[PDB]
Design a protein around this ligand. Sequence first.
Ligand SMILES: NC(=O)c1ccc[n+]([C@@H]2O[C@H](COP(=O)([O-])OP(=O)(O)OC[C@H]3O[C@@H](n4cnc5c(N)ncnc54)[C@H](OP(=O)(O)O)[C@@H]3O)[C@@H](O)[C@H]2O)c1
Ligand code: SF4
Ligand code: SF4
Ligand code: SF4
Ligand code: SF4
Ligand code: SF4
Ligand code: FES
Ligand SMILES: [Zn+2]
Lengths: 111, 147, 206, 176, 262, 89, 106
Amino acid sequence: VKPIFSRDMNEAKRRVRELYRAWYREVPNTVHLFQLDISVKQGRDKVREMFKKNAHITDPRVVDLLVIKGKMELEETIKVWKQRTHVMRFFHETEAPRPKDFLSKFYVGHD
Amino acid sequence: EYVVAKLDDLINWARRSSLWPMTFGLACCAVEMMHMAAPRYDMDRFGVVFRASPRQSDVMIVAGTLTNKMAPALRKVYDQMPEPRYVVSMGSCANGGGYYHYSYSVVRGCDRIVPVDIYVPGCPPTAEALLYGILQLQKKIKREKRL
Amino acid sequence: RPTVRPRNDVAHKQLSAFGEYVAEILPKYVQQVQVSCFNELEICIHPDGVIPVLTFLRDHSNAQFKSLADLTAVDIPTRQNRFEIVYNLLSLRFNSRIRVKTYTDELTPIESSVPVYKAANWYEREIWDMFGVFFANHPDLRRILTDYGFEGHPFRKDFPLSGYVELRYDDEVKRVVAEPVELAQEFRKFDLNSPWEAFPAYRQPP
Amino acid sequence: TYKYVNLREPSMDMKSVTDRAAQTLLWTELIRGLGMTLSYLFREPATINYPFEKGPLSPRFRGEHALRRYPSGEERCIACKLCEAVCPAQAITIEAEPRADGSRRTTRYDIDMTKCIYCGFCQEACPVDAIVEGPNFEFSTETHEELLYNKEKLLNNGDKWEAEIAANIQADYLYR
Amino acid sequence: LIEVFVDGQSVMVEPGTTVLQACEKVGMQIPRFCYHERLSVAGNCRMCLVEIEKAPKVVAACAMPVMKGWNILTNSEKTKKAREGVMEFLLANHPLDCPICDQGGECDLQDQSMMFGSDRSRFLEGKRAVEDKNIGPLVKTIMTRCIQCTRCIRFASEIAGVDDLGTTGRGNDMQVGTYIEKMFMSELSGNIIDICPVGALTXXXXXXXXXXXXXXXXXXXXXXXXXXXXXXXXXXXXXXXXXXXXXXXXXXXXXXXXXXXX
Amino acid sequence: XXXXXXXXXXXXXXXXXXXXXXXXXXXXXXXXXXXXXXXXXXXXXXXXXXXXXXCDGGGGALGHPRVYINLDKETKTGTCGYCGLQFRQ
Amino acid sequence: TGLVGLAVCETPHERLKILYTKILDVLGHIPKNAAYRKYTEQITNEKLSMVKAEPDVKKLEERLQGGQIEEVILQAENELSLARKMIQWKPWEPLVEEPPASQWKW
Ligand SMILES: NC(=O)c1ccc[n+]([C@@H]2O[C@H](COP(=O)([O-])OP(=O)(O)OC[C@H]3O[C@@H](n4cnc5c(N)ncnc54)[C@H](OP(=O)(O)O)[C@@H]3O)[C@@H](O)[C@H]2O)c1
Ligand code: SF4
Ligand code: SF4
Ligand code: SF4
Ligand code: SF4
Ligand code: SF4
Ligand code: FES
Ligand SMILES: [Zn+2]
């Protein structure tokens, strides 16, 4: 069909599963080889919240592009690349962070 | 009382004599930084030595443009430097992004990564104007550790 | 005209022969649209087969190009199909410049030019970086000009010039260089666009 | 055009082989290379010490920005936003208000030195010739705040360089 | 309806349709100075001169209708020789205000010199200046910058109601002023500054505050005065200073309220 | 003229009960000399012979585009767009 | 004598004749109605006549090459690969692919 991408509907879901195992094994390895930073358990919780935002699945075309991107930004650790605890860090350290409420945001006055 | 005030100037004279800068080739500014070596305008062995080295050097010149890729890279160089360290932001890109600025990749100000003591405003920072940056650094060192 | 005209058309009819010669083969698979203006030739190619077009012009008895050197891509949101990957080709034996274009939206993968041209793989990484177009059967697709912790694709007209992650503080944390801060200085949006049409003949009827 | 870099066998037989072998057995050409720097040592060096001697320049040179004025008082800048739009760095900002009564010449006038890549474009785009680039080198600060130029003021303080600017512009009208 | 081809392409038009009105259907805008939207059709400039397929003299677009099936070219050889010439006549007696002038980019005459008129040179020596006309609150009027046309003259007579602007002389001395020293009435005459193509009549409240270059425009309906819709407001960093009338089909007849303009 | 401590130059306000201004405390703030445009009125008005006069700073050397100024009204003298120089008769 | 390129300048005649006769047969396997066979054949036959007439002359190498026989041999070496790829992937013989959307002007 058009266009190919990589997988058709059901096959695209199992490509995410293979991607999930490869990244789950690296988070204990990126403590001793990289840096302690936060925690091994807290690093694994960062994985689950990342896939929840990506969880929609309507077409295999969108899913396949996420796999290629998932084998790049999460690949920035496996083959040993320089980051120095600045790159590949997803969580905000200095975030305020803002909340969504008609009493909290309106008191600060924004938009 | 009199010996205390005069000995402090003698330690400050040691840095007034010689300053070893870092040779960062991260700019068009770096070619003008190579004009400091060019005989017509020289601080070479007047104070400047082009040996550089990441650890032995006292001064580091941030030459021009810095990207978000080089932002963690230049920071770890600053940590390797000894305690008497002076940072010169030679070039308009180093001062706050001469060009680009509003761009996605270029870091604005350099002070967001590494604190700056002496600012040089010039894009093609003329070697004549570059001579001020080292001479002002030598003049700025006045008094260190009273008590 | 003495200073007003750059060059008179003389090789324009000679270059128009190429506009017929490749079109004499007449594939719906390859040819489609042939445009020739200002001593230059432009061809756009159907997404299904890009590699067979690139194997052509390479070698060939009539015209020898070989060098498929420089590789660009166009971002335009006017059409239903978004991106336009543009190949700039040069001949050493023949001494001529021809253009190869793609018309597809290419959010869905497109065929790679790596088996035909060796230096094409480095340019293919840039298109995946800036525009976000994946190349099928590509060896080593790695980020070059983008940051290691960069989200999205930096060139697309859908998002601003400043971006989302751009400002990098140091402040409170001893070693970690900041990322989530988003604010930058105000880029003044110029609304300078001249009234009246600039040139005749370029005007299209609604 | 062809020039050829390859020598294509300099040695042939007996006489041509021995001298090509002599330079590799001992040195000769290294001693000949030693003589190049030897004569280079004796000839006088072209060196300029900055606090006393000064380097060569030109009648038209761009450095630190300074806005000029008319011989009989009056600020020469007319407020157009002309130089604002040409500026490729967008370093120059201008907001204009009427001056007391009648005259309409500026209020906000900031030129960033954190920006500005130095073109002379603002010098060229100006119809009244307000910003004229003077021969400037001396500028060194502790902060960005001290470096970026305020609402005219410090730009108007370029009177110390305006005497040179008036001399330099006399070599500028009907260009060179 | 009779059809007549303009620039080879055929376009259907009404029997009493103007030449410039017929040009709009073919998607081509002729160089204008005397309006076609709402102001009455009048000559008194001869800029919109177009050459027919078989005609010795060029006819004005504002006055002459198409009527019969005749071919008219917009990018003709005679038209380009005309357009470059008339621009030179307009600028032989023009005071040169462009950097100081309140308009700059918004000025219609400024664009037409760049688009149509002769660029390389303009033969001129000695330009006449007119004395400043009296004006009340809105629009700081300068008679020198005025090109002496018929746009604001008919605006006071037809659109505004109360007539004030007219003719004062004969040659290159005729002013567009009121002749007698009297301030202009309010009502709806505040929109007269937006009508004029040249930088002669421009709002005194927002004069020299911001140029046309570097100003972000946004369309919004006015709160003050009922039945007011579509009015462009220029941001130009932080606080909005200039508000101009935006084109509307039914809500407003391309004229802002005097209370809303200030 | 100066308000409290800081001197006003080319129409500028210092601070409302000292809140905004804090940086100019250790270092002295800049001030343009004679920025009140007193030198504009100090120059004497030149007499005109013709109905319209052309203005120039100092030929093509000094930056002044040529503007013609009309003299018709007896009250209030006419001045050019670039200069504060006034003309009568 | 040696060529400037990495390809070794070997004194070999009729080597060009074998490769140019081989490619003519490959073209007459699958495409027949296509213009690709009809146009490429008459250029190759024109070049083969120059080789038969001129015996090891530099003027024969100067015709449509002018970079010796080594550059002309490279043109024949990749010609067999180009003909086989054109025979495998149908494009010249068949035309049935969909047309693009109506937009071109910028
Ligand atoms: N972890 C703990 O130790 C701990 C536990 C409980 C509570 N705290 C509280 O947290 C605070 C920690 O601060 P710290 O000890 O980290 O500060 P610090 O390192 O002593 O730094 C204070 C600085 O202020 C200057 N300074 C202070 N008093 C001065 C004077 N009279 N004259 C001149 N210079 C003076 C000193 O400069 P010079 O050196 O040049 O004079 C010094 O560099 C304390 O105030 C304490 O109440 C700390
Ligand atoms: S300031 Fe100018 S010379 Fe220096 S790096 Fe930036 S663009 Fe290059
Ligand atoms: S510097 Fe010149 S161009 Fe810029 S606003 Fe002033 S007068 Fe106009
Ligand atoms: S020199 Fe260039 S960058 Fe600097 S203010 Fe002038 S136009 Fe802007
Ligand atoms: S009316 Fe238009 S062309 Fe004439 S000076 Fe004013 S802006 Fe320039
Ligand atoms: S003021 Fe404007 S609209 Fe009125 S006559 Fe003059 S140019 Fe025409
Ligand atoms: S624009 Fe038609 S007569 Fe003036
Ligand atoms: Zn003047």
